[PDB]
Each structure stands twice: as structure tokens, then as C-alpha cells.
Amino acid sequence: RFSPYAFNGGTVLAIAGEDFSIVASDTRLSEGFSIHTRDSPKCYKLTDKTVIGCSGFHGDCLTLTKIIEARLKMYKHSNNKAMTTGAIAAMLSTILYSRRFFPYYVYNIIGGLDEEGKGAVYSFDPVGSYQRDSFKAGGSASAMLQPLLDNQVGFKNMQNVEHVPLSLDRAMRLVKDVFISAAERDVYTGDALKVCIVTKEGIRGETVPLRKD
Amino acid sequence: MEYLIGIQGPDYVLVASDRVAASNIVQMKDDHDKMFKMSEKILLLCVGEAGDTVQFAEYIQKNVQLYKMRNGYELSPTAAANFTRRNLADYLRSRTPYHVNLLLAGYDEHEGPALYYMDYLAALAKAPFAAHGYGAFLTLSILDRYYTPTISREKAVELLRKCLEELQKRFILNLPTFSVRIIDRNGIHDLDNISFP
Amino acid sequence: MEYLIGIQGPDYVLVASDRVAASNIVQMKDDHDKMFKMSEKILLLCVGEAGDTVQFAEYIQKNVQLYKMRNGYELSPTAAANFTRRNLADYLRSRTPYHVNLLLAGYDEHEGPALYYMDYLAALAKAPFAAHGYGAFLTLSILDRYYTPTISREKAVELLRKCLEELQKRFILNLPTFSVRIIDRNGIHDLDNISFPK
Amino acid sequence: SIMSYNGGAVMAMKGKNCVAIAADRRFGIQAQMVTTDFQKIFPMGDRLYIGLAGLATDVQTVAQRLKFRLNLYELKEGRQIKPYTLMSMVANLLYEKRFGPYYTEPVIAGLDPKTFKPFICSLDLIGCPMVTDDFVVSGTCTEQMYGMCESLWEPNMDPEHLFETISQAMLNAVDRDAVSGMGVIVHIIEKDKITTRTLKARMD
Amino acid sequence: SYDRAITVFSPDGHLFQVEYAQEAVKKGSTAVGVRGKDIVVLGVEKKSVAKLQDERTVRKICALDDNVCMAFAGLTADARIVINRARVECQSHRLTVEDPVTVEYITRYIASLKQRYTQSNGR
Amino acid sequence: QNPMVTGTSVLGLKFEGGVVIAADMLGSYGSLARFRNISRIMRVNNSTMLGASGDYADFQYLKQVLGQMVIDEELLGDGHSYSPKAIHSWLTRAMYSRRSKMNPLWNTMVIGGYADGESFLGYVDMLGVAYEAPSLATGYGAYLAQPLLREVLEKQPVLSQTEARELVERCMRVLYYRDARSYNRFQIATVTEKGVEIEGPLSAETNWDIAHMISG
Amino acid sequence: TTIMAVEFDGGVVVGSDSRVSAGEAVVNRVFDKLSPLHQHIYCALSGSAADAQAIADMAAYQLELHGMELEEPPLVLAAANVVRNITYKYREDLSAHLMVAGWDQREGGQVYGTMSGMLIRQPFAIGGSGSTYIYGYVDAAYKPGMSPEECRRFTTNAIALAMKRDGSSGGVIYLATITGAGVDHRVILGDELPRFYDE
Amino acid sequence: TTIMAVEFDGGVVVGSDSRVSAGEAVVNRVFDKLSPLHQHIYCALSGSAADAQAIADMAAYQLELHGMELEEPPLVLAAANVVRNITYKYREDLSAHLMVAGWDQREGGQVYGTMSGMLIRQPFAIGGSGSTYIYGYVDAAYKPGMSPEECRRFTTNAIALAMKRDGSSGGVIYLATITGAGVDHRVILGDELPRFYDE
Amino acid sequence: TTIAGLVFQDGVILGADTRATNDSVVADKICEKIHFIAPKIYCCGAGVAADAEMTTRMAASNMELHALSTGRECRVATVTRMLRQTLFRYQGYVGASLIVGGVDFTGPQLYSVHPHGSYSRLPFTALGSGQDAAIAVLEDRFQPNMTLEAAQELLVEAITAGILGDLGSGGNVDACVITAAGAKMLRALSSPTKPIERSSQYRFAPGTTPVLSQTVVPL
Amino acid sequence: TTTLAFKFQHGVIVAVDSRASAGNYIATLKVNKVIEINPYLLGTMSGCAADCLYWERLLAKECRLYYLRNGERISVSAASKLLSNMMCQYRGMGLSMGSMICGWDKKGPGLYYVDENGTRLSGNMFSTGSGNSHAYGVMDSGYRPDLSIEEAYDLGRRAIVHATHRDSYSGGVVNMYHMKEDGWVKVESTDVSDLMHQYRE
């Protein structure tokens, strides 16, 4: 018959530091065993302080992004100000939920800085539940990324070790290395990397090379 | 499945029900009262799907209370039975089917005592005694044996205790405590709750 | 579903089970005894599909009794556990799958008390206490809270009465009466049946 | 799937002259725990172990067949088994079942009895032998254990560092798995001796 | 349907339809009431009694609920509507809120009906 | 759903200062080759070029709609003409809105165009999946001529107009060999700054002489 | 897949296409569907290749013993029955379809459709999924008593019409002329294929 | 069901078979599949009769207004589009397939396959379930620039080949020659049907 | 999975890809798909992992019995029959798809065997998931009678186009060259992606391990 | 997902765990299931995380509309009825939510259980979630209405601690919310694993 949803792969990783929030994703867009194109950025920009990733069916990633960017302007025109990171989460929770009976298949991870200037990451589900966390992942490689962060970021399972808040200098090499580890062992990840770092100054996009196979 | 019962005496209607509210493998609420009072002398007993019982039987309780305020006199137990049917019947073919099982028990100044049976397909029946649930198979047999139209309240409660204590032996579900109420010319009257500690 | 339980004390193994035999909406037999005696100090507790419990657990009772007559000494509770598994495991892929849940409770002159858990897929586990059925969810929590390795049989029966009387409140099925037995160096010993005259 | 019924995790990582194999202690049925004493790692004799994961029936069923076939092999031969030969045994054991396969993914770790030579490998339901120079994992959490072992593993490590590496590899990978947990048992195979340690892990 | 403005403003700002409606009240049957301590009393005078009438069916003191009663003075054809609309709200309140109806809650709903019918098209 | 006259693979690849799109002239009903002369490449305005795959009955519907879209645009004469990115983003919504209603147009389209010195080659899909790539193919072209195009673009990212058509003729030649529903006659439509120009029906010189090797 | 055979005085001409396709993709571009069962006997494969190559080999074996033990070339009716028994026995499991054509010292040229476990002798026979489109060419253009030069031009013209309409057929035509002198194996390359209405 | 149309200088020849069959049984033995949409325009029905007679009547209506309001005979391209819009809009519910052929004062003879909601102008067109059996006769025997006497003999020979192979086709051939002078209705009875290879 | 083969003037060349995946993960990054049947005969598995291995083991063992029995160079046409009648015996349940090639004294011969038993002689072919990519490169640049020095690049470029363009193929490129002398194996002949570097070591100091049951067994 | 509540002399106590997982892989860890509504009203979370989170925001919306309109500070009994009536219109469309509403009204320490299909039950003791059965055992272990404040929390801890220990889909940290006449107050958020090795020694 007709199968409306296909899995296009993709991987999203967010880390909320004290002064920074990093949202990174790969470029590979692939349906089935074939690669359509090796540049398809998952990271999309909403406001200056907010970057949203979309991991899932690519047609919903394109539609949902145009719906969000439409309601950013509906808010900015009505309220004469940009949406806060917490407001984008609460809105997109109701946007994803209005589809409850024919859901969007996507994994949204919103990250950036809140009113306090601190990294705020909101991870969603296709049905629109959301909760704040220091680090989240998504997509096919989400299962590989999370255990690595529980150790380095969370200092779990280690007795008598000091807890130092993660530094951007260690966060850059932490995001790059988990993908170098994930792109190897995952077939849906590779061919390139985009890191969009959200600080108080602005968004800085950094591209990293990954295994091409 | 939850359990209902009713008995019609000459001057009275003696109804009883189980107080258990159960979900999955556990009993959530053991004091849950399934007896809904439509009017002064008119009761109602609803069991079925957990959500459809309270949702539907409250639509009736308001239409009955509304009728008494409009015309100044309450419905008779006969009219209240045929009204609950048509609502439950119209909801069958629509997109919101109700699954319920009703007992309408009432007393009337003229018609006297009345007891009505109803299934989830809204087929109304007026019987001297009736029961619902899986406990209706282990009980109505006992009611067949000991029931008489001349029975007295004193015997009825004693007769009701013979039925309800046999759900503790054969019937698999717990059902520790049973609520009991009686209706007469003086209105509804509560009776000592049958309890098997 | 039928209910089993067991408790391992230092010198003893205290097991209990429900006496109900139920079919459809009625209780056929309220005194039905689910405790199968494999050997002197070795019991067995089997619940599951009504026909598979008695059929399988009798195949074990004979193989255990046969071993004692061949070599002159009974099986230890350890060997009797790994034997019931392989038979129940070999069935799985054959054309006659058994659906059962076992508890092997025994005492040994050397190894001491032992209690074994088993599911219908024949995965053997040795636990200090175990339970089967839907009543195993409402019970093993209570056992977690009051159990201690130093418990005494005076406390154990009192502890067992705390668990079994809570199947009368939350648990939906009747289960009026519970059989109880205890095992020690002197062999199996019956205890006063816990009964709640509803 | 079916191998997700009882859950479970097995890991093996190769060092320089030593190997280490680890597995969790949890035995449960779907969403319900039973006991924490379950054993997923079995001795094949001196300096050779094998882990097993997947359905808990086949863990104990396949293992009892190996000690059956191993003890026959070690009595016929005048020597202990090589870890490379054992890989092909378990591969032949699982492949004869091709049309009614055991549900399990064996993980073999040990030392070549010759002198120092370490060896590890992993298998599948059908038993395709797979030899790796770094690590092998099997279980329902396998996806977790890839990322942990990728970053932590190094070409040559002394025994002290294997344990620290494989400990944090399991503990962190299991915490994100629902059906695995309840403590981890870690074995260390050296040339001189064998060190067994049961870690204290979150009970959940 | 018929949608047209009946109630409209005037050069003096007065609503004619609302003022003429109050003129209907200005000739009613006189209705009074007072508040005591534990008791409250209502009263009405009927000049239309010829002794041929049935006093029960012409009673202008009604009861919206067990805890609330009411009277009215004005055109009696319109009262049967508001009352039958208020009695529906009393029972729908007990269905929404298990508590009985507050005297103020049913007075708001009676007022919200007299509003909507002022601004609605063709009423 | 119903098997009504599917198309076949559509090749395209952007070269220096232009875009070339090759498509078979064969309409295919089931496994048949039924309509052997059809134009599957539509000219859209001056600067953009469309050709499609999948259901052909849905291609003449979009041929009719995009016809009105462009004609209605010319009627105003405002000077605005749809860029191939607008034609691409418009189809992405048409494909998606039909999808969300569970009544999709079963089709795959490749939009070529050259505007403002920027060559736009683009891709949409039934499900709404849409992107932009230097080389595209649909159906089994993505499994066949796609690694032929990528293997050239990795070594030579810059292709001329003469090298382009030569590589297109080779890739159409491979599809004629390796694709069951393909056919020998095809159109090569090359859009440049001079405007859309659709070359006549062409063919491929084929070397079958390996048939003698297999024999011996 | 399109196979064809035509009967004339001295012998038979066995034509076939080449292309083998699994689904909508082409496994093998040049493939020989004529597998000799015996010196003068040829079998044109059709249907499932895995099932047809098994039946063609089993038929080439059972018939090989028949050739040795009789110390004489087998007939074509013998070859058609060995193929029929294998096809009908396994007909649930094997979806293969064959065609047997050859020459003998007794009856001369013969052609036998083995389709689905049945057997017919036919003056001309067509098979495969591409057969259906040429049921109008072989009815009209066919005439009895054609010379070998006319038959090869009739078989070539016919299959060339099937390859153009069929998507599962195509490639080069194979032609084997089997007579009493021997077997002439030709190959018709794409440039030699007779041209027919292009549009 | 087999329908055919051929284009020549002065006009077009629209051929068809007769037999209408539901399943393996014959509902109607003699049935006219040519339903004129206008004076010089004729539509050859195909596929589901209930769906085709509805589309042929709706197309004969919408086009009738087009004829009156313009006070001029409509073109054939106008007739092919009215049929295409109805076929594509309902394509889920209606399984019908039509063929539109006729003559006009501008372009002359024209033939348009409407199949499944698409549109093509063709020099000769065949349709129906029986059309799959001859693509080989219409590829070979067809030549450009045929006289009306040759076209009618080409259409008659072609359909006569389809009726013999198709089980869902048969009966008498209808032939309508549409030219500028008028429309010549001809019926080819079974005794006039051209004989081909019998076996 | 991408495997391919090519016939040139003096012999044949068999390539393969080294990556093996279960579901979507990379289980092993270095794997041998080219197996050893006879000294001058090889083959390439594509399919179910073990079904393409165990199958070539049975053939490699049968051909060793046959070579010792006769005392003659193994014919390529024989290996094809053994793999063909074994796979067809299992009614396609085995998913092994093989490319058999080698040089006997009949001259260079390259077959291919599909999981259901369908085998075709030919000059060139490719199987696996990335077969559509490799064949397309073979079709275009092929031509009969190639020298050996020019025959290696066309196969490398055939598989590399099947690795880089497929999600099921990765790692290095194995190649096996066969001639009259024959038996020349080149392992990891091509490396499409060189960089593998992972510098930021996570190695940490021992001494944080909430460990309980520690014990030591001497040997 | 394990959740429980009970009321006694000094008022209600609510206890939940933090973990919400999808399949065998744990999605998040510290997720807060208990949903705050009013100052003195407190909801819970069971079933689909997005469904009950959405609809208990409408209840937070309707309770404010009630308090703004009437000013009567809605009772726990009515707030439980609003959440059921909203879920009854969408019945059959696959909404899965459990819930409990706690609070102190003029009547007393009301506690209710509102379900996906409209089940509305007052009562003394409740528990929901997948590990609900494991909670009733420890709660029925001799809980009494006469317990003091400190003795009551010790039961709330020890209930979830033993509930998540037996359940693989329940775990994380225990969130405990006491209830009073004025409003709820958070007692503690404590890791289960750290409480295990306490009660184990």
C-alpha cells in the first residue's frame, strides 16, 4: 500500500554547559541502503540564541521547521519580541501534540541559552512531551552517545572524584570524539559533521570531517 | 466483573451491590459505592466498563432531577426506565457506544415497587429480581429457590445474606464487602453493610 | 493465576501456596494441595496451565524417587533443580511445550537449605525467596522489607502471615486459604493452615 | 525481540598480555526482576572463559553443551583447548541449529596456551565467527557498549587498566539499559593469575 | 436565517429595546422579598384573581433548585424560558461540580442570557 | 496504488554554466513497454526544466497545474518569474499535502534550471522528502548511474557542456543495458542561459561483442 | 524472457533473447537460454532461472544415460518427456518452464512446449513472459513450407518484436539451426536486429 | 475487449470488437463499444462497462454544451480532455478506460489514448485487455500514408488477430470511417473476418 | 556488501569489501569475504554472514578431497556445480550469493552463483547490496582482452564506487589475482577512507572503582 | 513508572520515581512525573508522558478560570471531575493517562484517582504505574492513620525504594511531596541506589 513514514537516519547531540549550549548533527541523508546526498544539515536556526535539530523523517523535518519558523513570526508580530527558549519548547509541545492522531515522526532537540544566560536543552518526543536536561541525543546513534556522556559529563560510577562543570574547551573535543566513535560503528552517521555552538555572543558553525564510507 | 443484585418485596425493593473498584490485578478502592440515587424513591445501579458507568449514569441523574424541578413532581419508576433506554439505545449506532448494565429500583405511590433490568444493548425488562456480572450466575439460582412475593423485609435481608455469602465460596473474585439499601413508602433507607472480614 | 511463595531461613525453608483450584468463573476445589513432595527433605511447587502442572511435576517425582532407589541415596536439592530444568528445557522446542512455574525447596545435610525459582522457559535461579503468579507482585515487595538471613521460624511464620493477608486486600482473586509447610534437618513438617474465614 | 526477554549484557576487551570479560548479574522476566545471582560468564578452564547473553534458557543450555564438548575434547587431546579452536566449536554448535537457532550471542575471551597470546571473538544466532583485535559485545544494550568501548579502548594495556576500562564500560552502558543491571561481575585473565571482582552497581 | 440588528444605539446613547423591555417590568405583578437571619421570605400580589382561576398554575414564585428559589415581575411568557434555561444550568453544574449550585453562580448565568440576547442578530 | 503507466529513471547533472536532464521516452504499463514515444521532460518558463518519474498520469496533472502557475504569472507581466527553487519548494508542499491526506501523488521529480548564473538541480519525492544535489537520479538510476556520476564529480567537480552530455550518454547507455524498463530512445534537454532546448530523440551505440566471450 | 522455435524441412531454428531480470533490475545482460540436452537437442529456458537450470541439468543427465545405454542418439520426444516428468512432479516447488526443440534421424525437426507439465508438438512455439505481444506476428507472417533462410528471418523478426515491447526481454538474439549435418550457432547483434516501427 | 483506431489523410478508422464478458461468462454477445460523443467524434469504450458508459455520457454532456455555446463543431482535443478530467478525478472509484478518435476541420483525423487519466496523440492506438496480444502485427504491418481502403483492411486484420487469442474478446468487428463528408458505419460479420493461421 | 569480479587476458581478479554489519551497526571493520577453495580458485560471499561462509567451507573441503583423489588441477566449472546443487538443495533458505572464479587449463573463467542456484558464465559481474553500483562501473569501462596492470584499477574503481555509494559496504578493498601461475592474494589493496584518527584519549587513572567481592586465583 | 499516595491525620503524602524509558533503552533519568497545578493541588503522571502532561495543563488552566470567575478556590472533588470530563470526549482515540489529584479542601485531605477512560475514585490509599503492585505491599505493611510525620515519610521512602528495586521500568530518584492545609511541600529527592545500601545495612 502506502507507507507515509521512512527513516532517513540522522543523529543529533546537545550539551548544555554553564555559558554555552552545543547542538551538533551529521549531514548524511539516506533512505534505505542508499545515500541521497552527503550534505543535509539537520541543525536549523530559529532565533539568535536558539538552534533546533530535527532527526527523523526528512519530509516532516522540513515541514515542522517551516511551521515553527512561521509561528516564531506569529509570536514576534503579536508579542513584539522573540520567543524564549522555554516558550519554543512549550509551543512546539502543543504543535507536535495537535498531530496526536497522525503524529510527526521526528526527534526534536532544542538548545540554547535561557533568560538566565545558562545552557538549556529541551529534548522532545514525537508526541510532544518535553523535559530539560544537561545533555541529550537523538536519532539512530542516540543509544551510542548517551553512555559516553553519563561518564564524562555526569562523573557517574566513579567514587571520590571532583565535579567540575564542563568547559567549552572540553566540550568541543567531547562532541567531535563521540561522533568519530559513532560514525564508525553506525551506518547512518558520517560523511561530515556540523557543530553549531550557541553562546551569549552568537552562533558559530564548525564543520568536521568524518569517515566517508 | 462487578456484581449487582435486587429484590422486590410487596412494600419494598431491596437492592445490594459490591463495593469493590478493581483495576488490573489489584483492588484500588474497596468502599466504592455503585448505588446512584436518581430521585427520592428511585435508585439506579450501574456496572460495566469503568468509564462508561459513571459517565452515563450521571447523564440520567441530571435529567431525572431536572424533570422534577420543571413539572414539580418526580418521574415515576416506569417513565425513568424507558428514558434511560432510549438514551442508551441511541448511543449504540453512533460513534460513542456505551457498555453498561443497569438496575432501576424504585417505589411509587400508585404502581408500587418496581425493579428494572437493562443490558448494554438497551433492552429494558421489568423483573421481580435481577443481577449483573459473573456473580449473577451463582446468585439468581439462589433467588429462584427462596423468593416469594409475600416475603418480608426481615426475611429479605436474611435471604440476601444467603446469596451474598455464596460469592465468597465459589466465586473467584474477592468481593469482601457488600452495600445494601432498601426502599419503602418512607423513601430510601440504608441497611447495615454486609461485611466478611 | 495461582500463587506460590517460599522463604529460606538459616536452618529451614518455609514454603506456602494457595489451595484454590479454579476454572472459568468458579472455584472447583478449595482444598487442592499444590505441594508435591519429591523426596524426604525435597519439596516442589508447580503452578501454570492446569494440565501441565500435574503432568510434568509427576514426571519429576518419579525420576527423583527412582534415583534414590538406584544408588541408595536421594538427590541433593542442587542436582534435582538442574534435572527439572533440562527436561523442561528440552520440551520447549519439541511439539509438546509445557507451561509451568516451579519452586524447588529442599534441605541438605551439607549444602543446607536451598530454594530454586524456575519459569516456563526453564531458566533456573537460586534465590533466598521467590514467588509465582499475579500474587508474586503484591508479595515479594513485602518479603524485601522484612526478610533477614538470621530470621527464626517463629518470626518466619509471623512474617509469612503478613504477606498472605495482603492478598486478601489488594489482590482481586479470592484465595481464602493458604497451605504452609516447613523443612528442617528433621524433614518436612506441616504447619497450621492459614485460613481467613470470609 | 525474543533475545530481549531476559535482557543481559556481556563484554570482552583485549589488553596487551591479558584479556577481561564482564557481564551483569541481573536475571528477570521482561519488566520483573527475580534474582541478582545469575551467572552469565562460565569457566572453560585455566585462562579461558566464555560469556553468554540473550534468552536465559539458552545461556544455560548452550553452556552445558560446551562443557560437555570441551571435556570430551580435553580428554581426547593431550592438551588444553586453544581459544581459537573453541570459537569454531561454538560456531559449529550454533550452526547445526540454523533452522531452530538457540537465542544467544556467545562472547569468547582467553589466552592462547602457547605463551602469552590473547584472543577474543563474538558470534551470532547462526554462529558466524568474528575475530576482532579490540573488543566484542553482545546483549540487548549492545548499542550502548559500542560507544563506550570505542572511546576507552587502546591498543596495549596492562591488567590494571583493563579492569578500570571494562568496569566503567559496563557500569555506564548498563545504567541506560532498562532490562540489565543489578551489579556487574568482571573477570581478569592474566598470564600469572586470574582476578575476579564483583562491582557495586546501582540497584534498579 | 434572519440576521439583523434589532437592539441598536440611539443619538442619546440609550438602548430603546432594553429600555422598552424594562417598561414591561414597570407594569408587572408586584413582587417583594426580605432577608432574615436563618429565614428568607418572598411575596407577590395577584390582582387578576377572579376566583375562576387555578391559583397553582399561575404561581410566579418558582424554585430553580433545592437551595435556590426565585420570583419575577414582567411578561410571564418570557419567564418560562429563562427559568427553564436556568434549571438546565443548575443540573449541568452539579454534573460538572459535585457540589450544589451557589446562589451567585445561577444568578450570573441568568444574567449572561439577558446579555447575549441583547447583542445577538435578530433577537 | 493502481499500476497506471509508471515512468523510469531520470538522470540529471549540473555542469559549468548549465544543467542537463536526460529521460527515457518510454511510458511503461506494468512490465510492458506500451507508449514508446512520450515527452517526460516539460519546459517550465524559460529558465527551468522539469522531468519526472513514477506515475505519468500524475505528471500531466502537475504539467497542467504548473502550466497555469507559470502562465498566470506571465499574464501579470510584473517581471517576476518563478525561480527553480520556488518550483521546487512548491512541489515539495504539493507532494506533502497530498501525503498528509493519505492520497499522495505517486511520483518522483527532478527540477533543473539555470538562473542568475547559479545552476539549480533539485529533487523531490512522493513523501515530501526534498533536497538539492550536484547529481540526481530516480528509480533505479540512483542505484546505477548515480555512482557513475559521483565517481566523475569526485575526481572532476567541474564539468563542461561537452563532457556533460558525453557522460550523460554513457549513463543512459548503462541504463539501457542494466535497467529492465528502460528503452533506447531518449531525450537530452539542456537548459542554459540561452533557454531550454530539447534535443530530438536520440539513441546509444551499444557494444554487444562480449556475447562471443560468454560462448567460448 | 522470450524464447521461440520454428520447424522446417531439414530441421528447426531455436531463437531466444538474452536479458535475465530479477524484478525491475537486470541481473545478467547477456545470458544463453539455449542449453543443449544432447548433440542435436536444445532446450530453451524460461521462467525461474534457478529452477530451469536445475531441470535442464537433471534432464541432461537422465537423458545422457538414455544416450549411452541405447548407443544411439535419443529422439526429441524422449527429451520432451524427461523434462515433463521433472516439471510436473515438482510443479508446486519449481516454477520453471522449458521448451524442447531439436532434430532426429526419424521424424526430423520437432518442437515441444513443456509448459506447466503438459506436452504438445507444435510447428512453431513461443514462450516466456515476452511471448504474449507476438501472438499477432506469428499468426499472420507464418506460412508453411519455409526455407531455412526464410525461417531464420521469421524467427529473427518475431523475437525482435518481443524485445521492444517486453521490459523483461532484450539483448541479442541467439539462433541455433539444427540439421542432419550439425548445429549452426549464430548470434544476432543489436546492429543486425531488424528495424521495425520506431515510434 | 479490444478497441483500435488508425489515422490516415482524410480521417480515422475506429475499430472495435463486440463481446462483453463478466468473468468467464459472456454478458452481452453483440455490444457497440463506439459511443459517439458528437457528430464526427467517437469514443471506443474499454474496461468496466458501467464506469465507461457513465464517463461516456458525462463526456457527451459536458461536450454538448461546448458544441452549442461555440456554435461550431468541437475539436477532438476538446473531447479527449473532457474524458481525461473525468477519468483522472475519479480514478480510484472508476476503473474505466476510453479511447477518443475523430475528425475536425482543422487538424483532420486524430486519435487520443486516454488510459488511466493520461493523454497522448497517436497515429494508431489499441486498447482493452485484448490489445496486449497484438503489438507485433501493428508494429510490422503498419506503414505511413495508407489509403482509406488500406487502413480499413489494416484495422480489420489486426482486431481479427486479437479476437482469436483473447478469451474476453470476440464477435463482430465494428468499423466507423469518419471523414469530412460524414461517418460511414460498417459491420464486419464473422464470414467476412479475414482468415489467418488456423492451428 | 559489495563483491565483484573481472576477466582479463591472462586470468581473473576477485574483489571484496571488508565491512560486515548487523541491523544497522558495524560489527567488524576488518573481515575476509574472499575465501579459499582451490589453489587457483577462489570465491566471494555475499548474503547471510555464516551461510556465505559455511557454504564455502563445504566446497573448499570437497574440492580438497577431489584434488587429492584425482591429482589434477581443479576445474572452475566443478566448484560451480557443487555450490549450485548445494544452494538449490536448500530451496533458497540459505542466502549465500557467491562469485566463483579461477584459472584452469581451459583458460580464465568467471561464474556467479545466486542464492537460489542460478549461475551464469560471464566476463564481469558484481553481487551483494552494492552490486548495482559496481556493475554500472564495470559496464562502462570494460572491454575484452585487458592487460593485468590495467585490470586492477578497473576493479578497484568498481568496488570503491560500491563502497562510497552504499550504506552496507565499507572498509578496505580485498583483491585476489589469478593467472597461469595463479594464487596471488592482495589484502586491503585499497583504502578509500584513510583517516581513522581518534586522539582525545579518555584514559583515566586507576583507583576509582566501587568494587566489593575482589578475589584472586593463582595459577 | 511507580507512583503512590496516601492520606492520614496530618495529610497526604505523594511519592514517585524519576525514570521514564522507551523500550529496553532508558530515554531519560531524572524526569519529574508529579505535576504541580495549584498551590494546594498536586497531580501525578502515569501512562503516556505527553498525554497526561498535556491534559493536566488544561486542568491547571480550568482551575484558574474557576478561581478567577467564582473566586471560590476550587475543591479537590471538582478538580478531579474536570480532568475526567475532558478525557471522556476523546475516548476511543487512544489517549493513555493515569493520574491522581491530591489536596486539602474545606472537607478534608481529599485524594482522587482519575484515569484515561474517566474512572474517578476517592479514597485513603492509591498507587499507579507499572510498579504499582509493588507499592501496595509495603504500604499495607502496617500503615495506620495514627502515624506521625516522621513515621509517615519512612513509609513513603521504603515503599518506592522496594518498588523500583523489583521493577525494571521504574527507578531513578524518589520524589516525595508532603501535603498540608496550606499547600504541598517537597520533602526530598533521593537516589534509590543510595537508599538501597542503607536499608540493606
What does the secondary structure layout of this molecule look like, with pairings?
The structure is cut from a larger assembly and holds ten protein chains of eight kinds.
Chain E: H1 16-26, E1 31-35, E2 40-44, E3 62-63, E4 69-70, H2 76-96, H3 103-119
Antiparallel strand pairs in E: 1-2, 3-4
Chain F: E1 10-15, E2 18-24, E3 41-44, E4 48-54, H1 57-76, H2 84-100, E5 107-115, E6 118-123, E7 131-132, E8 135-136, H3 145-155, H4 161-178, E9 186-192, E10 195-198, H5 210-215
Antiparallel strand pairs in F: 1-2, 1-8, 2-9, 3-4, 4-5, 5-6, 6-7, 9-10
Chain I: E1 2-7, E2 12-17, E3 20-21, E4 26-28, E5 34-38, E6 41-46, H1 51-70, H2 76-89, E7 97-104, E8 107-110, E9 124-128, H3 131-141, H4 148-163, E10 173-178, E11 184-190, E12 215-218
Antiparallel strand pairs in I: 1-2, 1-9, 2-10, 3-4, 5-6, 6-7, 7-8, 10-11
PDB class: hydrolase
Keywords: proteasome, bovine spleen, hydrolase
Entry title: bovine 20S immunoproteasome
Would you write up a description of this structure?
- This is part of a larger assembly, with ten protein chains of eight kinds.
- Chain B is built from four helices and 13 strands.
- Chain B has 197 residues and is of the alpha+beta class.
- The two termini of chain B are 21 Å apart.
- In chain I, strand 7 (97-104) and strand 8 (107-110) form a beta hairpin.
- Chain I has helices at 51-70, 76-89, 131-141, 148-163; strands spanning 2-7, 12-17, 20-21, 26-28, 34-38, 41-46, 97-104, 107-110, 124-128, 173-178, 184-190, 215-218.
- Chain I starts with a strand and ends with a strand.
- Chain I is built from four helices and twelve strands, in the order ββββββααβββααβββ.
- Chain I has 219 residues and is of the alpha+beta class.
- By secondary structure, chain J is α+β, with helices and mostly antiparallel strands.
- Chain J is built from five helices and 14 strands.
- Chain J has helices spanning 49-69, 76-89, 132-139, 149-166, 192-199; strands at 2-6, 13-17, 20-22, 25-28, 35-36, 42-43, 46-47, 97-98, 100-102, 111-114, 120-122, 125-129, 173-178, 185-191.
- In chain J, 58% of the residues are buried.
Radius of gyration based on Cα positions of chain B: 16 Å
Q: Could you give the count of β-strands of chain B?
A: 13
Number of domains of chain B: 1
% residues in beta strands of chain B: 25-35%
Of all chain pairs, the largest interface belongs to:
D-I, 40 and 32 residues
Helix content of chain E: 25-40%
Give the oligomeric state.
part of a larger assembly
End-to-end separation of chain E in angstroms reads 12 Å
The total count of helices of chain B amounts to 4
Number of helices of chain E: 3
The main β sheet of chain E shows up as: 2 strands, antiparallel
N-to-C order of helices and strands of chain B: EEEEEEHHEEEEHHEEE
Broad shape of chain B: globular
Structural class of chain B: alpha+beta
* Major beta-sheet overview of chain B: 6 strands, antiparallel
State the end-to-end CA separation of chain B: 21 Å
| Secondary-structure element order of chain E, N to C | HEEEEHH
Keywords (chains G, H): Acetylation, Cytoplasm, Hydrolase, Immunity, Nucleus, Protease, Proteasome, Threonine protease, Zymogen
Protein name (chains G, H): Proteasome subunit beta type-9
InterPro entries (chains G, H): Ntn_hydrolases_N (IPR029055), Pept_T1A_subB (IPR000243), Proteasome_bsu_CS (IPR016050), Proteasome_sua/b (IPR001353), Proteasome_suB-type (IPR023333)
Pfam families (chains G, H): Proteasome (PF00227)
